[PDB]
Design a protein around this ligand. Structure first.
Ligand SMILES: O=C(O)CCCC[C@@H]1SC[C@@H]2NC(=O)N[C@@H]21
Ligand SMILES: O=C(O)CCCC[C@@H]1SC[C@@H]2NC(=O)N[C@@H]21
Ligand SMILES: O=C(O)CCCC[C@@H]1SC[C@@H]2NC(=O)N[C@@H]21
Ligand SMILES: [Cl-]
Ligand SMILES: [Cl-]
Ligand SMILES: [Mg+2]
Ligand SMILES: [Mg+2]
Ligand SMILES: [Mg+2]
Ligand SMILES: [Zn+2]
Ligand SMILES: [Zn+2]
Ligand SMILES: [Zn+2]
Lengths: 596, 595, 593
């Protein structure tokens, strides 16, 4: 029956294709499968996981602060593929390499491997459970901190949730294996971060409170986001209970000379350790990261070579190589960094369907300030709307919409709002002047909503005139969104999803439902038809089995299925197709609909 | 295991197609299957079969003579598809209709249903046993005579065989269920017909000795085939022991005025009954048949409407309709004729692959004199050699070669010789003068060298010497009967050869097949072995296999229900697997991908 | 410009195909050649003899003639029967000279009338009067024969007396010498207008009696020997010069022919001309018996267009009579050479072949005329009855009994057709059709015939069926043209001349009077596309393949090469690059796909 269910999936995708893959480019037909590097069998060294369990988060941050070497966070398992492959990387590929990281790079601070768009995308587009993914990683790397990206009042969603839901989720993330929570608000509104921060502290995990970088601190013609804006935020986040301060440079806008000034200042204004996250859209983010190490930053993020560059993080292997032998040498073995990068390279070839056409660095990033994780998304969206050839006008409109909104921090969810506004302005051919003019504009939902106050408040408030015109008579609020949401009745809502599914659910599954009621529901129902598809290797997940193909699938840690596609019938008079399989040497037939 | 093998055949044809059909036109998709007409429930009336068993052949011939009504032979089961569908018609379709003939047309003289090209073609191209065919027809029609065409000293083959082989084969044919042997020699040489004639009489069957018609008795500028030529032959064939005399007009050349003269004179030269066979290539053979009837002929041949016309026999239904109510009305129910024709029409639709492009009558026949059963085949051969656009020149060369040979009777196997010469004349551009020229090297076809040597026998005036001398290249020709020169077959040694090759005993029928066609019978026995009793399959399944998801009913003994459920891709061993359900049970059959 | 028109046609069909040919079988991807004739001037024949004798003495000559006289029907019934009448003027004209030179003893070429008039214009875009003129020019020594449907002209309804008159007059002027005129119910009163108009032009009037049933079957007494003999006396009294037996369905059997033709030649002094079809596969038997019985003239088709629903084989009929007292005196070698031509021509019309495979004694049951049997099976396939075809044949026989047992030839055959189709289609039996309670909606063909628009059969129409078909309306048993008002030639002519903004010819006006809509459509098309009739048949039906070269004669020669063809452009127009006599031409046409 689980076997039967998987055969059903395999038949369905063999006959009909995967909706995400069928119409897109395909991997090279030769294609060597990824090979997990050889393990010497020696046990694993204690790392930052044991230190945090031993010290607790406050003393661990002081240990971080005092540490001479720069500490590294690998983002390959989350931001890397979120930025380069629409977050489509599968558990199967991610979990198989965690043991290798654990034996070979036991000095890493953390693996960023959870949250951001992975929570949603795993279920919606890959029919897999992000909790299982984390558990598998936890088991393979017991010595390293597992790090998530948590969106403050949005959790791992897009809307603000009620406080008790946010707390309920943090608590389950901590139980499920997350050690280090990097938490951010899309407007750097400290007030809107406290519920998250307190929940993290209550779980006794590391609360790395982020400040999003935007603008340019060394440009005096844009004083809004000057040095003291950042240093004051760091002082506030310390007062509000952070263990670590992050600079989250989501669009890769921080320049090297600015990093040098910024990280010296941050280290003097707060006693907390500092952690630097950037994107390489400009082609020079490695310079910014190295300037930051030289200026004393305690940790920095990077991605494995094979998933670095452009809108991802800059190259881990090369950054390490640049530091090798220096005072802040991170003590990471380049040869293992390369072997793991080769694994990721072969992994990534399986995901050709989701590659963008981005060719290289673009200084244009300094104009538009689109975050690395949005840039490609928004370009596809523009192609959807018939705007491929105006893409540069859309980028200009994004920059113009930014100023029109007051000049804001742009990062999920607020980036999305600036994107929609920009696309509107190009389609309907509007200047800033028209959008504000006393000229009807049917503003997008996302924009009305922000101006009402659903994403929070920026420093100097939303612009009066534009807010007036978009809201159309409706009154805005300036209080914290979550302060107005009804407390959910958890007992009750648990009973709802459990009635829907005709079965009890786990606390994790309930946390999923709370974050994504419909998506979790659809995923639960798909899991029920198709069984544990996460266990299939990637080619088979996306493309089924070629004629006569033999596949080995590990359905439980113990049990291997040997599955052969022996034949496929024509479509019968009822629109069904029968796939003839051999399953462990036994004949099986599965009918699936002809979805053509 | 018979079942396994039939599945194997079904798989092989489904995956690879049938050689004879895969690249030829196909039946229309809708295709009503042929339906055996509903039987009213009246018994089978005693007919000519019981009369023959009672009277013996000599007295049965006298009964034929004395009968007022013209007697009819239906040729649909042999000459009709031989002439129109390259003799590709299958036992499955032939045998299913015999019980109806038996119930509905009890007054028929005979069913022509065996011999000619059917013996070879059934094994070679249809994978089926001509003996089994004959047995199934015998069983379904116990009241009618079963008639074969036998080639004199050429048997059911194309070369004159040893005497003892001809005798053995005639013995097996009688025992297999043949009652009425139409026997002919391709040169009308009565001396080369004796052996066969004697062997038929010895089996106590009907010897219908034929005289092939050629030329024109009423054209005094072609006196060699004049009226006394035929009447003298009839007298000789009667003295040689015929029970019935046939006029075998293989190319449909006899014209109506001539029929009126010929049959009257025949019935005056001999007391034996006379049986007239012709072809409709001219578009007027029905006039000739009717003139023959009015002149007193005792029996005539025709074909069911749906397989009549052009190179076949003229239309049985319309001939009966014309005689209806006349003094010699044959007493055949035209409504039943039409019902049986409607069955043959649906049967014929399944053989769309073997239809020719011939559109209708041709007076050209009087020029070339190609036997009806050769025409389409020679034209396909011309096309093969690139001569399609020069077909009319091949026809003219065929007439020219005939005269060059001294003007001869042209029917298997002499017609083939003349065909070979004609094709060579057109390909190499040779007139008759070039062919016999002393300065022009000609490499005569083997069939021509052989006929001039004496292997097919002697025409009345011998062979033209200059032509003969040039073609033989110093080899000496002979004028004795060819059989007189052949080694008697050592039958016991030869039985052992075939039984050792097949690792088993063969029946006497089988051995007769072997004697006539050693390689073809051997290949057939080996195909039977791999594929089982494929003759039990309906014709569409036999030629095209089963379509995807198709359900088929097949009667081996027990009725198999076969469903093509799926066909694998070709594997690394070059094999394809067909997934059948056989009576609700899974069967997977591997056959090679022969592309 | 006349050429420019031609090029646009060629381009159009090259790009788009022909509506009549696009989804039908195609010819072997693999040339009709006109035979080299000796070079002789033509020998005088029947045309010169008619001019010398006039029609009455000409008929006497035929009677007295010992040799059987032969009419070749290849140019009309032959393709009408086997190829939906689709044969083109290019192929018909090109061989006229060869007949003239090689078979100068023939009585006539049946080459006009029947369905050719309608079909030439409606489906082939060519003028039947041009076709006639070209045949007349090519064969000035032979009689040209048309089939005329009496009060139906070349149409489907009885016309006004004066239309008929005008038409006969134009046919005579256009070059017809011999009018075979028939009435579809053998009603002599209805043939008078026709026959008198034929005599007034001083041409040959061969009044046909259509044959049906069976004279030697006494359980079918309605159509006995006396019926035929009496009708022959009546048609002589009416002024016929020749009497024809038109056996349109091929029903006459040889024993019948022996009795019939002896009796006919005793009943009348007039010569007798026998026309039959070969659907049975024995018609040549009947023809040959007609000849032994003294018949004066017989029709046959060239071999390659003979047999089945066409006429019986000419070559073989001739060959059968060769050396006899009545030997027709025709050279078998030239008969074959001409047949080889028609065979190479015929292959060009593969699109229009039926799937009829040979003889059918079923014809004795249903009596569908040859020229119908194909079309009606097509019409029945059309109505999802492919597999009830044998049921349709019973309905036709049943319906004909229901109609009183009548003569079925155009347009009554077409009537019986529609009734048969409805009966199988609406699953109805003769008992149902004419029942009191059961509601039927009879075809407009049937309603009209029971009204009397096609004339009156012997005993008249069965009272019961007529009254229910009628639905209240009253029948008339008066001859239809004694009701139709005379047409205003002067005024009806202004209508076509002002619809066309041209003067038209008397020939055109005649076409218009016979087929108003069909003539007008043809005029437009002619204007659009030019003299398409001068195109060889493969180019007419399929256009020109890439790189192909083509010769055609606009006045009494163009070299046209298809150089290239562009894709379809923004306006849906395609461009075909041509070389006309060495010079470049681009011709645009719409992509109608
Ligand atoms: O990919 C998803 O959204 C979850 C699974 C739902 C659709 C499956 S994927 C294989 C098969 N092919 C289709 O097009 N639909 C089903
Ligand atoms: O061709 C024959 O009639 C008899 C010999 C057997 C050959 C068989 S027919 C089906 C299958 N397809 C092939 O081409 N070969 C085999
Ligand atoms: O008008 C005619 O000649 C009779 C048939 C109509 C077809 C012509 S052929 C060129 C063009 N292609 C079409 O489909 N319509 C016209
Ligand atoms: Cl959701
Ligand atoms: Cl052999
Ligand atoms: Mg430090
Ligand atoms: Mg007798
Ligand atoms: Mg005469
Ligand atoms: Zn990021
Ligand atoms: Zn024969
Ligand atoms: Zn006719």
């Amino acid at each position: 029956d689980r076997a039967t269910k998987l055969l059903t999936y395999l038949a369905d995708v063999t006959v009909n294709g995967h909706p995400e893959a069928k119409d897109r480019p395909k991997p090279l037909e030769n294609a060597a499968r990824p090979v997990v590097p050889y393990a010497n069998g020696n046990g694993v060294k204690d790392g930052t996981k044991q230190l945090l369990d031993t010290l607790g988060p406050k003393k661990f941050g002081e240990w971080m602060r005092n540490e001479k070497r720069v500490l590294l966070t690998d983002t390959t398992m989350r931001d890397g593929h979120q930025s380069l492959l629409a977050t489509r990387m599968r558990t199967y590929d991610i979990a198989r390499i965690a043991g290798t990281y654990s034996h070979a790079l036991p000095n890493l601070l953390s693996l960023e491997c959870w949250g951001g768009a992975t929570f949603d995308v795993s279920m919606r587009f890959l029919t897999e459970d992000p909790w299982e993914r984390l558990a598998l990683i936890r088991e393979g790397a017991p010595n390293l901190l597992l790090q998530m990206l948590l969106r403050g009042a949005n959790g791992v969603g897009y809307t603000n949730y009620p406080d008790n839901v946010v707390k309920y989720f943090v608590r389950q993330a901590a139980k499920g294996g997350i050690d280090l929570f990097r938490v951010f608000d899309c407007l750097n509104w400290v007030e809107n971060m406290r519920v998250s921060m307190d929940a993290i502290a209550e779980e006794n995990k590391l609360c790395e409170a982020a400040i999003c970088y935007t603008g340019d601190i060394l440009n005096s013609a844009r004083p809004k986001y000057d040095l003291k804006y950042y240093t004051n935020l760091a002082v506030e986040l310390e007062k509000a209970g952070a263990h670590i301060i992050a600079v989250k440079d989501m669009a890769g806008l921080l320049k090297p000379a600015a990093a040098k000034v910024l990280f010296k200042a941050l280290r003097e204004a707060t006693g907390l350790p500092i952690h630097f996250h950037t994107h390489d859209t400009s082609g020079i983010a490695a310079a910014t990261v190295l300037a930051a190490v030289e200026a004393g930053v305690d940790a920095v993020d990077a991605a494995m070579d094979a998933l670095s560059g452009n809108t991802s993080q800059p190259c881990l292997g090369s950054i390490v190589e640049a530091l090798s032998g220096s005072e802040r040498d991170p003590g990471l073995d380049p040869a293992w960094i390369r072997r793991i990068s080769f694994y990721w390279e072969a992994v990534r070839n399986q995901y050709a369907a989701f590659e963008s056409d981005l060719k290289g660095p673009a200084s244009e990033v300094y104009l538009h300030e689109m975050p690395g994780g949005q840039f490609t998304n928004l370009k596809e969206q523009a192609r959807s709307l018939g705007l491929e050839t105006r893409w540069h006008q859309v980028a200009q409109a994004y920059a113009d919409a930014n100023q029109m909104f007051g000049d804001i921090v742009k990062v999920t969810p607020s980036s999305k709002v600036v994107g929609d506004m920009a696309l509107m302005m190009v389609s309907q051919d509007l200047t800033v002047a028209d959008v504000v003019s006393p000229r009807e504009v049917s503003f997008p939902e996302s924009v009305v909503s922000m101006l009402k106050g659903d994403l929070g408040q920026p420093p100097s408030g939303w612009p009066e005139a534009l807010q007036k015109k978009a809201l159309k008579g409706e009154k805005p609020y300036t209080v914290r969104p979550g302060s107005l949401l009804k407390e959910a009745d958890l007992d009750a809502e648990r009973k709802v999803i459990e009635k829907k599914l005709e079965r009890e659910v786990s606390d994790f599954e309930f946390a999923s439902y709370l974050m994504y009621p419909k998506v979790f529901t659809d995923f639960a129902l798909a899991s029920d038809t198709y069984g544990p598809v996460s266990v299939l290797p990637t080619p088979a997940y996306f493309y089924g089995l070629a004629d006569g193909e033999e596949l080995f699938a590990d359905i439980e840690k113990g049990k291997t299925l040997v599955i052969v596609n022996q034949a496929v019938s024509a479509t019968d008079s009822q629109g069904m197709v029968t796939v003839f399989f051999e399953l462990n040497g036994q004949p099986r037939r599965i009918k699936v609909p002809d979805r053509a």
